[PDB]
């Protein structure tokens, strides 16, 4: 419209309506110029390229992008509590993005005629980097101003070299809307249909589903011999009942497993050697090994053992102010998947045993351990939980086929996820005027809820803040103005029958 | 098909009209594999889940109709005409579903038999003989239920959700005959079982029933793999071998509960599915474990357990006259080929549970008020008739 | 039926990240302080551009059933008859059938064009395009932990020679 009139207002709140919630978040951002307006090839060779497993080839672009893909972008700690205590499920429905109050600076003075380019890729033609759990999200706390992350991508590599099949992308080849200080930008997005994330824990275990008072009518082999001696072979059949529940026939079996090595928080229980990389579980792709992280959804530890965690099997966040490299255990926050132990195998245990031979009169029975077990008919499992600090959605790769596309770091797998939103400063002149821009961003998401009808008589477990006194308030600022998240908050408190 | 079955039942008082905590420690403590925690209820329930209930000596269920009538409440023996029997169905599936565990207590196969209604109980989360804070307790009185005197009746109908037809055909062709030829499809998954011979001189002279058994571990507790993935019971021509925990074993009429001989039971065999499925005691196949070279021979290893691969096909387990019909699919984020492993039709919303108890009638109370709950009751039981009608669609 | 996929992927599954930006996730970098008895620690690093092998990923490559590797250069092969003895097979009703072609997997690692799976391919066509989402036919799917470590016992792993479907797998079919 003009210079002296605002192109948008400040919208931050939540609105709880019946079976849906509407989260609205506004932040202030600052966009510099990246690469001095240039598109530059990058490779491990530019960093030296130590290991083959780390080899990559790609391009940095002058463009930036917006990332709202973490839950603490859209939910306050109180709103997250109001969600996870009252609901069995939720999922995103609609998305509303706005960009307004443009200001462009020179180095400081206002530049009224400079522009800012912005577009979205809604046909999904660009490499999609929003599913990789990168930094650069919107700040959890609305009073924080954030820098916009640079957009860059990777393609096929051989060592640090490219191949004939590698693609190069010029984002200048995309039509975009150019904004001055009076223009604003918006679009609406419709989340494709995803299943509700299960915000609950089972009050039963897969192996306890039986009526404890009544026998089965099936028989199991109780004795293969009469007693001590020679030639005592026999076939005896007890019926499965309450007293021995381990042998009863069952219709459903626990889900798949890929075993993790366990590490103990008490450090003197760990082996005195380096096994972080060597003792890791991993998968191999075209010769390059990738750590299996976080991997298939499995229980972090057995009941009663809280000090053991799967090596790569858990999601680990950092505390406010924590460093980048080789920080102490206290500095980070290790989440656990203990809720899913009722239906999923423990990450650090074998799945079970299998017969490795034929017994005979001359040969004893032999059983081996199952270190990994892929999907079998009859399996049922739980997906990994989502956290307030964790990602929301991911992009399902475009492939011939997949199984259970739900992303392994948590969240809603989508073939058409929320599109990437690209932004850059239009250059004003290999000699350009030093320039940066700033403004506001508001995102609005409609969430659908699933209420619990549960008949449980005794009271549930809820998420609750500590009653006791402390120097600071949890999920608040300190005396220096630093906002911090004291702990990871999972979604699973309420219970369902199995 | 459409079947109709009517039976005569008797419902006692269970637990003296009382809810009780039960655990392995109340049963003596057992071991960790057998550890459990739960509750026993005064309520009973009806289970028609077995085929011989609905049938005398492709298909799938469609509709269900259930009636409860001719209620007679006895006191202990005289008639009590003023007494009610309470009954409800769990149609939101809010209670723990015990009907898919293959328990005894079915409608008897022979229509003239008069049977006892089994007592309802359930299990919850356990760390041992103990409970955790996540363990749930259910009061069935906190469910609305109809109350019936001797002239009242109870009926409801149910609609089976859409399920695939059960295959009741034997293939004339085998997957490999559709050795080194290229084939578009491969046999289904395997999880190996130990091979037991009904000729006792052939089997190893040692105890290996539990120790040599295939199992799966959950939260540190080992469960037997039973019956397990659906596989052929034996190779062609060998009829004396059966998987140790692989097949369904029924007892003959009058068979004892503990340590019966092999002539007292009926071992089912899956040998019809051997066209598309691997043998249970056989390995799935071989894989290369190395890279050959001028210095190294080609090496192979046996695949004991193999998960789903693209291009696999398999038959489910056969249903038997004495076998179960349906099971409830657990409510989870994910499952694969939910068809229950003991056989039958898997359903997210199976036929609902039908819960029944006798209303307690207190004995003579004291003539001065006391705040204790009443522990003194009239000895009382009920009896009546039950009809169940299922419409079976055939293929 | 779904469309056949004529195109090849210009990205590999493990490279889907933004190369310029760190993750907000940590991994276990260091278990021992170093060069002494009772040097035991937990140190955690951010996963990022410099170390891409440890980053958290949402999807994993598809299923594998390993084929024995054969070189089109005859002098590199072992001097023995391994056509049948070293072949990957599946058993049906006590009968052994070769696995041909088998699960769709990459014929060979990038840069080595002389190797082919013994019964893995259609005969000699190569699958090399699908190595972005699929494991190599002649390689293990990866490693798993075979033990609980402790102060006494070192950590142990083992190779996964065959790996069935897992949630979060993506794969390409064989090319027509």
């Amino acid at each position, epitope marked *: 419209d003009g210079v002296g009139s605002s192109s948008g207002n400040w919208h931050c709140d939540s609105q709880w309506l019946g079976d849906r919630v509407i989260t609205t978040s506004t932040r202030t951002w600052a966009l510099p110029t990246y690469n001095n307006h240039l598109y530059k090839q990058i490779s491990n060779s530019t960093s030296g390229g130590s290991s083959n497993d780390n080899a990559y080839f790609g391009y940095s672009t002058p463009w930036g992008y917006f990332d709202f893909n973490r839950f603490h972008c859209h939910f306050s700690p109180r709103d997250w509590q109001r969600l996870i205590n009252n609901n069995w499920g939720f999922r995103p429905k609609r998305l509303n993005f706005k960009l307004f109050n443009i200001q462009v600076k020179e180095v400081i003075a206002n530049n009224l005629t400079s522009t800012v380019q912005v577009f979205t890729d809604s046909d999904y033609q660009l490499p999609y980097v929003l599913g990789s759990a990168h930094e650069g999200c919107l700040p959890p706390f609305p009073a924080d101003v954030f820098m916009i992350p640079q957009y860059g991508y990777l393609t096929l590599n051989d060592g640090s070299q490219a191949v004939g099949r590698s693609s190069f992308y010029c984002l200048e080849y995309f039509p975009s809307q150019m904004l001055r200080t009076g223009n604003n930008f918006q679009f609406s997005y419709e989340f494709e249909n995803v299943p509700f994330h299960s915000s609950y824990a089972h009050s039963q275990s897969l192996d306890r589903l039986m009526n404890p008072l009544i026998d089965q009518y099936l028989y199991y082999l109780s004795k293969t011999i009469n007693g001590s001696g020679q030639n005592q072979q026999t076939l005896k059949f007890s019926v499965a009942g309450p007293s021995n529940m381990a042998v009863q026939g069952r219709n459903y079996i626990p889900g798949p497993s890929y075993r993790q090595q366990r590490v103990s928080t008490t450090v003197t229980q760990n082996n005195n050697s380096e096994f972080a990389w060597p003792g890791a579980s991993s998968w191999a792709l075209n010769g390059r090994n990738s750590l299996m992280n976080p991997g298939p959804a499995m229980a972090s530890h057995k009941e009663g053992e809280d000090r053991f965690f799967p090596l790569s099997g858990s999601l680990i966040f950092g505390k406010q102010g924590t460093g980048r490299d080789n920080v102490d255990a206290d*500095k980070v926050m290790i989440t656990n998947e203990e809720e899913i132990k009722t239906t999923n195998p423990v990450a650090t245990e074998s799945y079970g045993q299998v017969a490795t031979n034929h017994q005979s009169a001359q040969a004893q029975a032999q059983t081996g351990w199952v270190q990994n077990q892929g999907i079998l008919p009859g399996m049922v499992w739980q997906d990994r939980d989502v956290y307030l600090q964790g990602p929301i959605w991911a992009k399902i790769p475009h492939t011939d086929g997949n199984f259970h596309p739900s992303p392994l770091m948590g969240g809603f797998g989508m073939k058409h996820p929320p599109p990437q939103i690209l932004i850059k400063n239009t250059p004003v002149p290999n000699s350009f005027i030093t320039q940066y821009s700033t403004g506001q961003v508001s995102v609005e998401i409609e969430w659908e809820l699933q209420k619990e009808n549960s008949k449980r008589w005794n009271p549930e477990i809820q998420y609750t803040s*500590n009653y*006791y006194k*402390s120097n600071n308030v949890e999920f608040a600022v300190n005396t220096e103005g630093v906002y911090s998240e004291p*702990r990871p908050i999972g979604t699973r408190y309420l219970t369902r029958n199995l | 098909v459409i079947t109709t079955s009517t039976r005569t039942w008797a419902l006692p008082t269970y637990n003296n009209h009382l809810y009780k905590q039960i655990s392995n420690s109340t049963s003596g403590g057992s071991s960790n594999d057998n550890a459990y925690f739960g509750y026993s209820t005064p309520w009973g329930y009806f289970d028609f889940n077995r085929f011989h209930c609905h049938f005398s000596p492709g298909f799938r269920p469609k509709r269900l109709n259930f009636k409860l009538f001719n209620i007679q409440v006895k006191e202990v023996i005289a008639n009590n005409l003023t007494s009610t029997v309470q009954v409800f169905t769990d149609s939101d599936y809010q209670l723990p579903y015990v009907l898919g565990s293959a328990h005894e207590g079915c409608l008897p196969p022979f229509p003239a038999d008069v049977f006892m209604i089994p007592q309802y109980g359930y299990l919850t989360l356990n760390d041992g003989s103990q409970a955790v*804070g996540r363990s749930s307790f259910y009061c069935l009185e906190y469910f609305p239920s109809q109350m019936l005197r001797t002239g009242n009746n109870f009926q409801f109908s149910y609609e089976f959700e859409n399920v695939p037809f059960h295959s009741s055909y034997a293939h004339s062709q085998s997957l490999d005959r559709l050795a080194v030829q290229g084939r578009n499809y491969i046999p289904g998954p395997s999880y190996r079982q130990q091979r037991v011979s009904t000729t006792v001189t052939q089997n190893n002279n040692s105890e290996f029933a539990w120790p040599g058994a295939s199992s799966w571990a959950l939260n540190g507790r080992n469960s037997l793999m039973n019956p397990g993935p659906a596989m052929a019971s034996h190779k062609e021509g060998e009829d004396r071998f059966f998987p140790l925990s692989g097949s369904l074993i029924f007892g003959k009429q009058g068979t004892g509960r503990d340590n019966v001989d092999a002539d007292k039971v009926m071992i089912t065999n899956e040998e019809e599915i051997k066209t598309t499925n691997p043998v249970a005691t056989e390995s799935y196949g071989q894989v290369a474990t190395n890279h050959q070279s001028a210095q190294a021979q080609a090496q192979t290893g046996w695949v004991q357990n193999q998960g789903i691969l693209p291009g696999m096909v398999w038959q489910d387990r056969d249903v038997y006259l004495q076998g179960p019909i349906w099971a409830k699919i657990p409510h989870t984020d994910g499952n694969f080929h939910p068809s229950p492993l003991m056989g039958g039709f898997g359903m997210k919303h199976p036929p609902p549970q039908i819960l029944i108890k006798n209303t307690p009638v207190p004995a003579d109370p004291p003539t001065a008020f006391n705040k204790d709950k009443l522990n003194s009751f009239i000895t009382q039981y009920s009896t009546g008739q039950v009809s169940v009608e299922i419409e079976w669609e055939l293929q | 039926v779904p469309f056949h996929s004529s195109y090849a992927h210009s990205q590999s599954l493990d490279r889907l990240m933004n190369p310029l930006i760190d993750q907000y996730l940590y991994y276990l970098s260091k278990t021992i302080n170093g060069s002494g*008895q009772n040097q035991q*620690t937990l140190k955690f690093s951010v996963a990022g551009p410099s170390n891409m092998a440890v980053q958290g990923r949402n999807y994993i490559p598809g299923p594998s059933y390993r084929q024995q590797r054969v070189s089109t250069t005859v002098t590199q092969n072992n001097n023995s008859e391994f056509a049948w003895p070293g072949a990957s097979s599946w058993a049906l009703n006590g009968r052994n059938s070769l696995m041909n072609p088998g699960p769709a997997m990459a014929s060979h690692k990038e840069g080595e064009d002389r190797f082919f799976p013994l019964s893995g391919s259609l005969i000699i066509t190569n699958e090399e395009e699908i190595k972005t989402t699929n494991p190599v036919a002649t390689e293990s799917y990866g490693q798993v932990a075979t033990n609980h470590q402790s*102060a006494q016992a070192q950590a142990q792993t083992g190779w996964v020679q065959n790996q069935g479907i897992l949630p979060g797998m993506v794969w390409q079919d064989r090319d027509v």
Partner: antibody, heavy 130, light 111 residues
Framework: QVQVVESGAEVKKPGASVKVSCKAS????????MHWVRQAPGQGLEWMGL????????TYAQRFQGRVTMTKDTSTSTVYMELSSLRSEDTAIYYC???????????????????????WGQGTTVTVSS | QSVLTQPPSASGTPGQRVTISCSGS????????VNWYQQLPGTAPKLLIY???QRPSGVPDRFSGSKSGTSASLAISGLQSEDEADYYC???????????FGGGTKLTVLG
């Protein structure tokens, strides 16, 4: 082997300040927490303060706040405890304890770090007398 | 207002079972793990049980630890003369925001 060599016994008058040093050797100094706990001659144990593996974060018992100071020296692998404005009741033995539990567990309900100290120093007898 | 309390003394004869218990507030025993220390006269305390029931390496199987509600108990079985020492039950206390020790329980063998 792991050892925690406690400092020497001392005798102090009221108002004086006593510093007790704790020298660890045979393991990684940075990795573990260090606890200070005093025991009166006839009385049970009393927890005084805590210093984290990094040395940046320190917690004190409320009784001792403002009159106690703790510092950790990575160079010589020594932890120090400062007690000031001594009183007759202060006279005790001062133990230095190593804590092998590095991380917090974040389960349902409030989080916690296990504070069990496996290695204890021999102890130092500090008498406050005239 | 949050306290850890144990009986000042206990007694038993060798081979008998002896249980030592302490009572704690909701802030400490109720929400935090409980560890047990055994101290012989003239020597520093030795950890016996940690994380409620877990036992450290080099510690005899006879010692056992349990936590129920806001009360924690330590069980000693197959008692011997050597076992006689002062026993302390400890737990982190949230209100205090520090570690809190019980008063200690002096065990006395008989003979």
């Amino acid at each position: 082997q792991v050892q925690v060599v406690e400092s020497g016994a001392e005798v102090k008058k009221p108002g004086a300040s006593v510093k007790v040093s704790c020298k660890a050797s045979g393991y990684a100094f940075t990795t573990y927490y260090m606890h200070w706990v005093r025991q009166a001659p006839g009385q049970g144990l009393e927890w005084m303060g805590l210093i984290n593996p990094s040395g940046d974060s320190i917690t004190y018992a409320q009784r001792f706040q403002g009159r106690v100071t703790m510092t950790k020296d990575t160079s010589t692998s020594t932890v120090y405890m400062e007690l000031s404005s001594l009183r007759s009741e202060d006279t005790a033995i001062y133990y230095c304890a190593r804590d092998p539990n590095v991380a917090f567990y974040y389960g349902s309900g409030n989080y916690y770090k296990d504070n069990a100290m496996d290695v204890w120093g021999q102890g130092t007898t500090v008498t406050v007398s005239s | 207002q949050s306290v850890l309390t144990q009986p000042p003394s206990a007694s038993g004869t060798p081979g008998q079972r002896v249980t030592i218990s302490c009572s704690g507030s909701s802030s400490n025993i109720g929400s935090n793990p409980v560890n047990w220390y055994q101290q012989l006269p003239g020597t520093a305390p030795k950890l016996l049980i940690y994380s409620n029931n877990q036992r450290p390496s080099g510690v005899p199987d006879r010692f056992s630890g349990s936590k129920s509600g806001t009360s924690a108990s330590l069980a000693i079985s197959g008692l011997q003369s050597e076992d006689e020492a002062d026993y302390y039950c400890a737990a982190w206390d949230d209100s205090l925001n520090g570690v809190l020790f019980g008063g200690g329980t002096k065990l006395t063998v008989l003979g």
